[PDB]
């Protein structure tokens, strides 16, 4: 139904659900404050980079299991379009715009925790093969 598609969609638009991790540190260089995040935190599945409401959005890269800086996938959330929710979790990150860079490290990377086997970002909505 059209009403069913709407309820499922809203339900889903809610999960960054789960125990959260806040254990993040960053390089601190005064020249780079203009792209520093206010918050970085994760779900053990997705990772949020939060910037001031009206700041320009910089771009974010992950350090992969392979050792290489890598371009992930991500979408913005929030009324102010100031939160980048990366569709993945990682030990280490780079925030970049132009020649500005901020290193961001995850002090509790625990792959292995936090998976959901649902087929969606949510513990409450599930992907079904028609």
């Amino acid at each position: 139904a059209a009403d069913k598609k709407r309820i499922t969609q809203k339900l889903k638009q809610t999960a960054f659900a789960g125990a959260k991790n806040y254990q993040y540190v960053m390089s601190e260089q005064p020249e780079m404050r203009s792209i520093q995040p206010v918050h970085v935190w994760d779900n053990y599945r997705f990772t949020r980079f939060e910037f001031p409401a009206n700041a320009e959005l910089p771009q974010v890269y992950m350090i992969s299991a392979s050792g290489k800086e890598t371009l992930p996938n991500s979408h913005v959330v929030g009324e102010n379009r100031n939160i980048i929710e990366v569709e993945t979790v990682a030990k280490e990150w780079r925030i970049r715009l132009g020649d500005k860079v901020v290193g961001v490290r995850n002090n509790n990377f625990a792959p292995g925790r936090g998976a959901v086997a649902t087929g969606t970002a949510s513990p409450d909505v599930r992907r079904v093969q028609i």
Partner: peptide
């Protein structure tokens, strides 16, 4: 040759969350 983008300097490393974020 092509020079890669800057790498952070970690000499001073600092927590990100001065306060706990909320998921609205």
């Amino acid at each position: 040759g092509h020079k890669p983008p800057p790498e952070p300097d970690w000499s001073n490393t600092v927590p990100v969350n001065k306060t706990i974020p909320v998921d609205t």
